[PDB]
Amino acid sequence: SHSVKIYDTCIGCTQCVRACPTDVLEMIPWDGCKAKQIASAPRTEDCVGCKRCESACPTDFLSVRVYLWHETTRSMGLAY
Amino acid sequence: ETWVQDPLHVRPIAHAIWDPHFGQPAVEAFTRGGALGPVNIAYSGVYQWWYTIGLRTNEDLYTGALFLLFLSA
Amino acid sequence: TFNNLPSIFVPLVGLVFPAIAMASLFLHIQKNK
Amino acid sequence: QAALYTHHQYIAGFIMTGAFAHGAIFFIRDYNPEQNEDNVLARMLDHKEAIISHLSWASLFLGFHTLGLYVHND
Amino acid sequence: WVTFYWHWKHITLWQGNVSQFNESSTYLMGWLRDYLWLNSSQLINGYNPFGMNSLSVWAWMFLFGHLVWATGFMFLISWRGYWQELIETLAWAHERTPLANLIRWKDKPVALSIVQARLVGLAHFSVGYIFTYAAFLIASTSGKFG
Amino acid sequence: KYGDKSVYFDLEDLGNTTGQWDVYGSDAPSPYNPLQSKFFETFAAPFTKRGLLLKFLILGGGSLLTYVSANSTGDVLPIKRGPQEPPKLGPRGKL
Amino acid sequence: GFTPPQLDPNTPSPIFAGSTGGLLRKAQVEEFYVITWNSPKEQIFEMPTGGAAIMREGPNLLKLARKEQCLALGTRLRSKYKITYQFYRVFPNGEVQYLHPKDGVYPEKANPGREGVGLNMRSIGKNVSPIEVKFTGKQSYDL
Amino acid sequence: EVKILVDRDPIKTSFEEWAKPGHFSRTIAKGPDTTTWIWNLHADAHDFDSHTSDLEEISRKVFSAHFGQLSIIFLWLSGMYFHGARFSNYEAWLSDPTHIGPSAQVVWPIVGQEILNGDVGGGFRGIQITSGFFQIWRASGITSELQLYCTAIGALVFAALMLFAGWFHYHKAAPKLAWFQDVESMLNHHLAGLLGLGSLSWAGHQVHVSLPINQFLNAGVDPKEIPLPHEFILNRDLLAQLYPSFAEGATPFFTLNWSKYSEFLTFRGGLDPVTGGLWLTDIAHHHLAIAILFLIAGHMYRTNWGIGHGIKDILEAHKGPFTGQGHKGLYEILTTSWHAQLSLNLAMLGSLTIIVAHHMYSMPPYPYLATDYATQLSLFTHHMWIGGFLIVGAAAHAAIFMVRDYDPTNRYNDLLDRVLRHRDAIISHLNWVCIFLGFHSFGLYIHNDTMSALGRPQDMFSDTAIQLQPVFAQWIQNTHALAPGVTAPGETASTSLTWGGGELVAVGGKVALLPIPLGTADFLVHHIHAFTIHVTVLILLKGVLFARSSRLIPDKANLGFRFPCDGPGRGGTCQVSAWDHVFLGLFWMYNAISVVIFHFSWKMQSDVWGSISDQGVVTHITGGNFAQSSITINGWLRDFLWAQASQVIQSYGSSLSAYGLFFLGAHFVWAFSLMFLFSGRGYWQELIESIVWAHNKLKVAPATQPRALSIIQGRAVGVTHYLLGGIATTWAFFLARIIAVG
Ligand code: CLA
Ligand code: CLA
Ligand code: CLA
Ligand code: CLA
Ligand code: CLA
Ligand code: CLA
Ligand SMILES: CC1=C(/C=C/C(C)=C/C=C/C(C)=C/C=C/C=C(C)/C=C/C=C(C)/C=C/C2=C(C)CCCC2(C)C)C(C)(C)CCC1
Ligand SMILES: CC1=C(C/C=C(\C)CCC[C@H](C)CCC[C@H](C)CCCC(C)C)C(=O)c2ccccc2C1=O
Ligand code: SF4
Ligand code: SF4
Ligand code: SF4
């Protein structure tokens, strides 16, 4: 559904995923920062698009980035 | 054809109206321009512009409409 | 008959052409291949 | 004579809004900044803040003053 | 503004009293009184409790345009979330209402997307703007023809 | 098991879990008389092909609508009665 | 191949007098996201479907409506009650997909054993304009 | 049990915190990195539940804030009584109140605004007020301007006293939480001690001061000739000359021989036909009975002694069969939360304001109120608006309870849980009945409009075409007109004359509330009112119930009560917050109360108000055009809006010219509000950043970074400008319309 992307400006503060209410994100090891971790987005099918991840990305503009795309029943957040 | 003769004192007519919800007061009020039925007054000026470019009969407008139908096809 | 043609075409158009159109378009919406 | 004027002016306003909207759609979809680098179009996007600020000035000036005058007369 | 200016200047010229515009157009209550309130006299009386006239259609269109111009404020002021929750309640009720549980939608109902509902509000808003002013202009210039 | 003490996730019986229940769908047999049922069956089997039913419905309804509106006189709808009144001369002569 | 799924058994559910925010027909034709947790005591918690429920001492089980419901519940559990939780996805065919840690560890601790996807090795301004990917399925951000 | 638990010198009186703005909050007490900070300084100013976590400091803050509000109201009443004393024609209005316009405000001649000082009457140039203070003062037996100045000075004194009281009860000796939580004593005192003794003391004024003075004022006596009020207290012969029952004193009272008190404590219901207001003789007996009732009602709750109902023991006693534990827990969620109490008191106070509006036109309690059509209209409209606003705030504060103070773990309730568990059923049936009412109340107007436009007036829903008569309201009307008799003897007449069997109270040339006939138009508009109320309750109740969780957002409480959204996901989730629900309910309250006051103005001007000549032929202000034109929307546009807005727009160069000015201005402010409700923050932030480039180009970059308004702030600005503009439009329109034709 939605296309979440994490760019290489991430500092690995784990706010993107601790804010994400649908388990879309997960921190993985990395070698590009002092924290040695970066966020990944495997479960984009569970992405609703609420952008709580990028409302918590403390960078110049953003490192995590949500692109609104094909909306399915779970990205639209329907219990019916 | 009536507008061509006395244009200053004959009202244009866009098209007739067949609205079956109408009451008889509304059938009586919308009868303008010397028509035997309800009508709508052409506030589009097509009468003036057709009369200024020739087109002084209903048959002229019929030929024009048929030719424009041919052009649409 | 020319005075009777609106009485045939207006009920035809403004009721049947919605029937035909909205029905066929609802079927085109609710379709699967 | 009133219906035609009103018609064509609302049509012109819509057509103008659409002209600008399609220019925006161009600047997003079809504008290649590398193929027109530093050209009239690229030098245009540079001082977008200047354009926006001076149009803001003109509208702000006009609205302030002319509303003030209409209100003074009211 | 353009067409109000046009219609008032011209209806005053045609009526003969250019002084009406030249004195009343310089203060907005002239436009609200001497243009909108005055030229809407023969329109809103298109259908009174005692009879109607040819301007009944223009009064009905006037009010129709007022109606959609107000309905656009719904899609503009109200945004998506109140309606999604309302539709969730509605879907619960339809799926737990007997003799309508037999009927189940094929497209899962949702409130209108934000950009969509914006567009819809503007469509109603502009349709009402246009139909209202068309009714008013046509009826005022046709109720008298100067 | 769905009937255990506060267990509602019988993974085998997913119907009881998800709520798939005919809440009032009685499986009781036909309470109608057999003869009138056969009568209605034989007299409504023409309306068994939904496509033919739809074509018949649309075409016959449009035909009946055109027939009613064309054969009806002005006594049942004033729009066909016509003006039956002289036309008023509009403002400024007629213009 | 280091953390196996848990395959939730027929555990008891919380004590709850029933609400209207529960499982609609989405569960009857699509997934419905069971959650499982393990309580130290019989305490009371807010349900994500509205209303108050009484969790049971020991393992519990709740089939609420969707992923965000169980994850909001589990976050409230882990923060307010300090309790391990894990939730699933139960398609109507019968399969039970394990989803919340997918590694035995919550998705904040960068624990190795997870492959990075949705990962553009560039700053966010260095994406190409749409004209460079016009008439192509890749929109702007998949190169 | 109950006590005076109160701690001394908790907070220091110092300007040190005045100098540091935003001290109350943590994020605000560090500096304005942005401009939004200042909007957050005012937004959170009185959000004491967010400043602290303990209820003691919050209770002290709101207690002293109530003292500040009472200081403000005492200062406001000081202003009103003073302006009546010095800048008014009240001393002249008593002579000829049916023809002199009550005025209490004069403007300063500077810029031509001295036209506002008009010919109100009484040899006085001012503004025709529509507050009804003059009517009160005639009901209070003032008969002077000295008494008004003394009242203003005493009110200023009480304002300073309340200011000192707030300072004392926050900074010097602030009560702790055990004092506020003793709601038993609070109710025992506010019932018996505020409302009981207050009504008793007003009954004393009504018996000793208002009644004897109005017995002369109504009997053609000039105010200069009337004896002063204290002369009735000092000399009982003058008081007894009109009410001889005072010669016996309290011996009729204490011996229970009250039958010899009916000269001044009456039950002759109806309006005094000499002035149009209710009998003050009945109002004295009223406030007396209310004193007895509230005095026996304020000895209901146990405070310290073995007697009295513990409110816990009342609530826990009520436990429904399938309603669960019932009302257990409510004493702990009402006494440990100010927002719940605020919501309850707001809802009831607002509906009470509306009931005040409704009972103040149909039973005019003050002399020369019903004939001051401006005062009557303005008071009804005012109190209706206040009631709608208070109800909408009750919704907001119920939501704030549900987000913040609601705790099913500690402060549990059963009934609230049961309401949350079938909230979808509540909102579904409300969302249905709103649509049903919308259709069968407004689509009826549309049907009438179309049938009248198609030339089919025999097909409308009118009093002539299709009968939709209020049979139930007509039955209540006819049985309240024939109520004096078997059901309510000893009343001598109906309790009101707004019923068909009543009569006309001719006061001067005016009519003053003859019966109100209920027809199909009243049916239609009353169902429109039910419709608008039901939609407002839909929006507001939905916000309250789904304040915490929905199928869309199950963690909405963690996002807060006052938040814009949770992103464009889920198709968009704007305005899921209860704040946004009440922001919409504000608009719907506006539509509701606007059509309500339109119904009032038109039904009154057409079927009630007017002028009755000495021959008896009453001619109404419009001419009875309500039941025929209020069946279609074009009548409201033509005969109400277009026609009755011929005195606000034609009032240019008149004394009523500020009304047309604010007509256009409130129009403007409403439309200006549409810039906020329709737009979004992102456009304005981008524009602000462009003009900030224009500023940084000139070394005029402000450090308080210019930020566009927050989303919720844009919505707040939109709804407040929208309401202010629509409401001031209506205020100007009503006041000019009703002062001009009067
Ligand atoms: C209940 C209210 C009502 C209704 C239903 C109608 C119905 C009608 N009136 Mg109206 N009328 C009314 C009240 C009403 N009137 C009132 C109160 C007055 C004032 C007295 C009038 C005055 C009036 C006049 C003066 C005229 C009519 C006319 C008509 C007819 C139009 C013909 C048609 O089929 O349109 C078809 C519909 C349209 C053209 C609407 C176009 C816009 C649509 C919504 C968008 C379509 C979407 C998409 C592109 C297409 C997809 C398919 C779609 C079917 C879904 C129709 C029978 C006309 C007539 O008789 O000519 C035949 C005419 O001239 N009426
Ligand atoms: C009556 C309604 C109204 C008014 C007054 C405005 C006013 C404005 N809009 Mg528009 N707008 C409106 C409706 C309105 N809008 C609607 C309905 C929409 C659709 C969403 C928009 C969409 C919109 C956009 C998208 C843009 C504007 C812009 C502007 C600004 C243009 C500059 C200008 O002329 O300002 C001159 C100033 C005024 C007109 C303000 C009048 C008020 C007076 C001068 C203030 C002083 C009075 C008093 C002393 C203050 C104290 C009051 C009280 C606290 C005591 C201006 C603030 C543009 C902008 O910002 O350009 C700079 C812009 O980009 N608006
Ligand atoms: C005049 C003497 C005085 C002084 C120096 C202080 C000093 C203090 N008070 Mg105290 N207080 C006083 C009188 C005083 N108070 C009175 C008379 C009351 C009763 C209302 C209170 C009630 C009170 C409470 C309840 C609280 C304080 C608090 C405070 C502290 C912070 C106040 C602050 O920065 O906001 C300064 C605010 C202002 C200067 C303006 C406030 C608004 C005033 C009261 C009324 C406005 C009327 C105005 C006409 C209405 C607007 C309409 C207008 C548009 C026409 C500070 C130690 C706070 C504290 O210590 O908590 C940490 C706190 O919570 N005070
Ligand atoms: C924005 C707030 C506001 C404002 C500005 C006004 C302004 C006005 N009101 Mg309104 N009013 C309001 C809110 C407001 N009211 C609310 C919320 C209520 C509901 C209690 C009322 C009830 C009310 C009544 C009943 C009357 C007014 C009157 C008046 C006018 C004279 C003012 C006055 O004090 O006379 C002196 C005040 C009185 C004579 C009122 C008597 C006291 C009332 C009946 C009860 C006592 C209050 C009680 C202790 C607290 C509530 C208890 C709780 C159980 C509900 C003036 C137009 C009076 C009027 O229009 O006179 C022409 C009038 O008769 N108002
Ligand atoms: C008994 C009455 C009462 C009380 C005690 C409160 C108290 C409170 N309310 Mg509630 N409220 C009330 C009535 C009341 N309100 C009513 C009647 C409404 C309906 C609109 C609301 C709607 C409401 C909402 C929707 C919210 C609150 C909030 C709050 C809290 C903080 C408000 C704040 O800091 O703003 C301090 C004061 C201001 C910011 C000034 C407001 C400016 C107004 C709108 C000015 C314009 C009005 C004016 C009359 C017009 C003249 C214009 C002129 C100046 C030019 C506070 C606990 C908020 C809260 O709890 O947040 C968590 C919140 O979100 N209230
Ligand atoms: C005039 C403008 C207008 C209209 C018509 C509506 C209409 C409605 N609003 Mg909206 N709303 C508006 C302005 C308007 N709103 C604005 C400006 C706001 C800003 C705050 C809102 C905010 C708002 C909220 C927040 C809520 C509503 C709700 C409602 C519904 C209640 C009435 C209903 O369904 O009964 C029936 C419908 C009507 C009365 C509308 C008029 C329709 C007429 C009678 C008949 C229509 C013709 C008929 C179907 C033939 C079709 C012909 C075919 C050719 C199409 C309805 C959808 C509530 C809701 O959805 O729950 C009920 C709700 O919660 N509205
Ligand atoms: C005086 C005169 C003259 C002259 C004149 C002139 C010279 C004029 C000019 C004018 C002008 C000068 C005008 C203009 C106009 C313009 C416009 C109208 C514009 C528009 C724009 C747009 C719409 C845009 C779009 C876009 C964008 C947005 C971007 C991208 C690109 C594009 C372009 C697409 C003469 C002698 C001849 C004659 C007489 C008169
Ligand atoms: C206009 C607008 C804005 C921008 C509004 C701005 C920020 C208000 C303009 C600035 C105010 C007037 C402060 C400037 C006055 C200061 C007190 C400085 C004083 C300077 C002199 C006047 C003394 C939004 O942020 C917005 C957000 C969401 C939905 C709609 C809208 C919206 O319609
Ligand atoms: S919030 Fe942004 S910076 Fe922080 S861990 Fe997530 S992607 Fe990295
Ligand atoms: S948009 Fe929402 S669901 Fe998607 S990754 Fe961001 S926080 Fe998670
Ligand atoms: S449009 Fe505004 S309110 Fe709606 S989701 Fe986007 S940011 Fe939130």
Select from H558, F3, D66 the least CA-distant residue to G46.
H558
Q: How far is A22 from chain G (nearest CA, A)?
A: 5
Q: How far apart are CA C16 and CA C22, in angstroms?
A: 10
CA torsion sign for H128, H130, H135, H140 is negative
Residue H38: strand, helix, or coil: helix
Q: Is H514 exposed, middle or buried (0-12, 13-18, 19+ CB in 10 A)?
A: buried
Select from H313, H545, H554 the least CA-distant residue to H416.
H545
Question: To one decimal place, what's the resolution in Å?
Answer: 3.2
Buried b (16+ CB within 10 A) or exposed e, H678-712: bebbeebeebbbbbbbbeeeeeeeeeeebbbbbbb
Residues of E in contact with C30 (CB under 8 A): 106-107
Q: How far apart are CA H440 and CA H524, in angstroms?
A: 8
How many helices and strands (H and E) does chain H possess? 32, 7
Half-sphere exposure of C12 (CA within 13 A, CB side): 11
Q: State the best of G28, G37, G60, G95 to mutate against chain F, taking most chain F CBs within 10 Å.
A: G28
Q: Could you tell me where the beta strands, DSSP code E, fall in chain B?
A: 15-16, 39-40
Buried b (16+ CB within 10 A) or exposed e, G53-75: bebbeeebbbbbbbbbbbbbbbb
Question: Does residue H202 contact residue H287 with C-beta atoms inside 8 Å?
Answer: yes
Chains touching C (at least 3 CB pairs under 8 A) are B, E, F
| Sequence-distant (≥ 6) Cβ neighbours of residue H329 within 8 angstroms | H411, H412, H413, H414
Question: Does residue H413 contact residue H419 with C-beta atoms inside 8 Å?
Answer: no
AA letter at H234: L
Please tell me if residue G15 touches chain H, with a CB cutoff of 8 Å.
no
Name where chain D breaks: residue before each gap, C-N > 2.5 Å: none
Question: Does residue H497 contact residue H514 with C-beta atoms inside 8 Å?
Answer: yes
Closest ligand 6 atom to residue E82 Cα is: 25
Q: How far apart are CA H453 and CA H441, in angstroms?
A: 19
DSSP assignment of F12-68 equals S-HHHHHT---SS-------S-HHHHHHHHHHHGGGG-HHHHHHHHHHHHHHHHHHH
Quote the tokens at residue A5: 């992307």
Closest ligand 2 atom to residue H668 Cα is: 1
Select from G24, G27, G67, G74 the least CA-distant residue to G47.
G74
Question: Does residue A51 contact residue A59 with C-beta atoms inside 8 Å?
Answer: no
Please tell me the experimental approach by which this structure was elucidated. cryo-EM
Quote the tokens at residue F81: 């009665």
Residue H395: strand, helix, or coil: helix
Q: What angle do CA G37, G42, G43 make, to 5 degrees?
A: 85
Buried b (16+ CB within 10 A) or exposed e, H567-604: bbbbbbbbbbbbbbbbbbbbbbbbbbbbbbbbbbbbbb
Quote the tokens at residue H482: 């024939």
Question: Does residue H96 contact residue H123 with C-beta atoms inside 8 Å?
Answer: no
Residue E102 to residues E93, E99, E105, F31, G22: CA-CA distances in angstroms? 13, 6, 10, 21, 20
Query: Are the beta carbons of E104 and G25 separated by less than 8 Å?
Result: yes
- Give residue G62's Cα distance to chain centre: 12
Residue H496 to residues G109, H278, H460, H523: CA-CA distances in angstroms? 76, 9, 33, 21
Residue H125 host element (H or E): strand H125-128
Quote the tokens at residue H315: 């609530």
Nearest by CB to residue G48, choosing from H324, H425, H554, is H554
Question: Does residue H649 contact residue H663 with C-beta atoms inside 8 Å?
Answer: yes
Q: What share of chain D is helix, strand, coil (3-state, %, to 5)?
A: 85, 0, 15
Question: Does residue H587 contact residue H535 with C-beta atoms inside 8 Å?
Answer: no
Bin B45: left if φ > 0, else alpha if -120 < ψ < 50, else beta: left
Residue found under tokens 């304040």: H547
* Strand-pair partners of E52: E47
What is the number of other CB atoms lying within 10 angstroms of the CB of residue G2? 8
D18 lines ligand 7 (CB under 6 A): no
Instruction: Give the per-residue SS3 of G39-73.
Output: ECCCCEEECCCCCEEECCCEEEEEECCCHHHHHHH
H705 lines ligand 8 (CB under 6 A): no
In residues, how long is chain D? 74
Backbone Cα Rg of chain G: 20
Q: φ, ψ for residue G102 (rounded to 5)?
A: 60, 35
AA letter at D71: V
Instruction: Give the per-residue SS3 of H565-610.
Output: CCCCCCCCCECCCHHHHHHHHHHHHHHHHHHHHHHHHHHHHHHHCE
What is the number of other CB atoms lying within 10 angstroms of the CB of residue H241? 13
Helix axes E2-15, E114-144, angle to 10 degrees: 10
H678 lines ligand 2 (CB under 6 A): yes
* Beta pairing class for G119-120 and A3-7: parallel
Q: Could you tell me where the beta strands, DSSP code E, fall in H273-339?
A: none
Select from E118, E127, E7, E1 the least CA-distant residue to E64.
E127
Q: Pocket of ligand 5, candidates H343, H344, H400: which has the most ligand atoms within 8 Å of its Cβ, to mutate?
A: H400
Q: How far apart are CA H664 and CA H354, in angstroms?
A: 28
The secondary structure of residue B40, as a DSSP letter, is E
- Give residue B59's Cα distance to chain centre: 13
Q: What angle do CA E79, E83, E85 make, to 5 degrees?
A: 125
Closest ligand 6 atom to residue E71 Cα is: 2
Q: How far is B30 from chain E (nearest CA, A)?
A: 6
Question: Does residue H372 contact residue H554 with C-beta atoms inside 8 Å?
Answer: no
Check the annotation: does H300 bind a ligand.
no
Q: How far apart are CA D34 and CA E120, in angstroms?
A: 37
Q: Calculate the CA dihedral of residues H726, H727, H731, H733 and round it to 10 degrees.
A: 10
* Beta pairing class for H103-105 and G119-120: unpaired
Residues of F in contact with E144 (CB under 8 A): 91-92
What is the number of other CB atoms lying within 10 angstroms of the CB of residue F32? 10
How many helices and strands (H and E) does chain E possess? 8, 0
Quote the tokens at residue E90: 């509605």
DSSP assignment of E129-143 equals HHHHHHHHHHHHHHH
Q: Which ligand is nearest to the CA of H46?
A: 5
Residue A28: strand, helix, or coil: strand
Quote the tokens at residue H651: 């009032």
H579 lines ligand 5 (CB under 6 A): yes
Bin A46: left if φ > 0, else alpha if -120 < ψ < 50, else beta: alpha
| Sequence-distant (≥ 6) Cβ neighbours of residue G125 within 8 angstroms | A61
Nearest by CB to residue E145, choosing from F23, F24, F92, is F92
Q: Which ligand is nearest to the CA of H76?
A: 4
Residue found under tokens 């259709």: H439
